[model samples]
Target: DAEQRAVAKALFDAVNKHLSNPFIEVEMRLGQFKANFTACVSTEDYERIKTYLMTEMENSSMTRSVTHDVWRHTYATDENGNPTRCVSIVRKKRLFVKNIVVPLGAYNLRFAVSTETPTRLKDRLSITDGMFRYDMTQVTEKGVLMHEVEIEGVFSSKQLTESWLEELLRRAMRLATLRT
Candidate 1:
């Protein structure tokens, strides 16, 4: 048991270091962690779209439930020095069945808006992009296994909506399926 606790602590520390940002704050739970930060979009159009979405979420009809154990907000300026994007990272255990959850495993989900493209597509065209990165890790008989998936898309500032984000979430879930 002590060895398991040490391994978990080391893993959490590694993840925390990888996500370290002056404008980000990370919260850790028994087996979950989250980091929240904001980045600037490359254009005013995208910035306007992000602002609109935040405003819309405040209304009663668009309200959503909060299910995470811990969350916080932080902001940072990108290379272009614009601060109009909001980002949030949520980490939680994967539920395999109604009551069955992954032991010694968790998912780190990052959702953000920025002009920057995913590292996998750095050489591609740069435009307003919605970015999502998901990492799923579990300790197995062999060792710790991790599966990571990242999705990004170019769209008009107005085209970025909750449905687009939901699609990203689905893609992340697909990554988990691949691990099975």
Candidate 2:
């Protein structure tokens, strides 16, 4: 045990400096509470990525009308060139749909929304959750851009999962776009 500990300690010290960690949060059947999320996923063309994120966040909170939104109305048009209501309901909304966006940094943001309903009932009258940060580090710290999405005051299934967060990154990147 002593010998192993001695060897492990040396290896531990060697590896410690190379480790990195960031985090997010969640709740269980709670109400009007905060689940701050500091999350991020990758691939970037800074300008477009940041712009897309901001625009998405803008539209996300723009649905204040609920019954009548920029993204939805009785006169809405669908992708298949059809006018339909189901399009709005079933469409994947990157708009944040029912959330608030407050940029904490040029790239980081804060998302405030309802876990249930009555998010408006909260304090937009005075007030907001999600924050994000991006580190343009290399191969893991080189060509890769480190992205994190920090969500605040929300609920989910056992906090955010790998599939969900990974999907989030994938969606943003798919739309963020670049060149061939």
Candidate 3:
């Protein structure tokens, strides 16, 4: 177990080192929206930061709240009968506007660790296509209406370079890396 933890720390360290370039260009697409940014961090500190996040995810309570909600994660076999990924289903709540809470959406995120090893120290994990559905009711100056939307998208990354993307990974990994 110690060796395994050491390996994990080393892996995270390598990733953090790889991300330590201020000039690095990182881009991601969510539907038609694209984001670009840069960030850097050291392996030692980043590893500890990630460990703390993982611990929080592990010790999270099941009771839902405005600030926190429980996520249900499981492993399932694909059509090829390969058990190689984890799926997380969470009910994301809405924000309060004018003392009213509105329903936002729910999303199921599927993450798969890459089996291909281009180098001994480098490994990739991709967020494959997942389902997202949302229904919201809002009141505007013009009128009041309800909107329903559904989306299915795939988010794959070779490297974590962008700050926003890295933060997104930090939050998503919190749910994805749960022991349950």
Candidate 4:
């Protein structure tokens, strides 16, 4: 009962925090100019972050629809020690998260930034004038604390330059190297 209660508490705390501000930091690079976009997550938001991302990638005029899928999956255990997993499969133009019909042209971009430094300016920057990509991670292994978090996906663009690409890579790498 105690362990179950604790897990419930953690989930509650996490979901409550999620409701407050779930938007991940977004940084885009094109040539020498970089664009920063901040998405806002609201209180008690069920799945707005997911919706917003889907919308931006799909409707934004400058972007293209590539074959892609986005889904949310979480592992869980019952009081009887029964294990279970929650998984959602997202496809092009499918009704996502209930009855919300995602448009035919809706696109998906694998993007995410950790909550560790949500509002802070990016630790690094980069450019490529070629294909650009980003990696992200969340770590918590200070001595065995079981601090785990979900990782979204790798984000990429064809518009950045080599110099800009280097800086962005630094940000992703720094998060991966964090000890605690």
Best by lDDT: 1
Taking the candidates one at a time, how many backbone clashes does each contain?
Answer: 0, 27, 0, 15
Give me the overall lDDT of model 4. Answer: 0.29
Residue 95 in candidate 4 has what lDDT? 19
Task: Name model 3 segments beyond 4 Å from true.
Answer: 1-37, 59-121, 124-180
Query: Model 1, which residues run further than 4 Å from truth?
Result: 1-107, 116-148
Estimate, for each residue in 93-157, the C-alpha lDDT of model 2 and write its tens digit.
Answer: 23232222322322323333233311011001100114322222111223333333232223343
Write candidate 1's Cα lDDT for 1-180 as tens digits.
999999999999999788553232111111124333211112332334334434533333321211111123323335554443445543322222121133233233344333321101011111222353222111122342222223455343235567765666565443323223
- Candidate 2 minimal-lDDT segment of 10 residues: 118-127
Off by over 4 Å in 2: 1-44, 59-158
Candidates' TM-scores?
0.25, 0.21, 0.18, 0.18
lDDT, residue 29, candidate 4: 16
TM-score of 1: 0.25
lDDT of every predicted structure (CA atoms): 0.34, 0.32, 0.29, 0.29
Model 3 agreement with the true structure over 132-164: per-residue lDDT tens digits: 111111112223221111111222442333554
* Model 4 misplaced regions, further than 4 Å: 1-158
lDDT of 4 at 104: 37
**What TM-score does candidate 4 get on C-alpha atoms?**
0.18
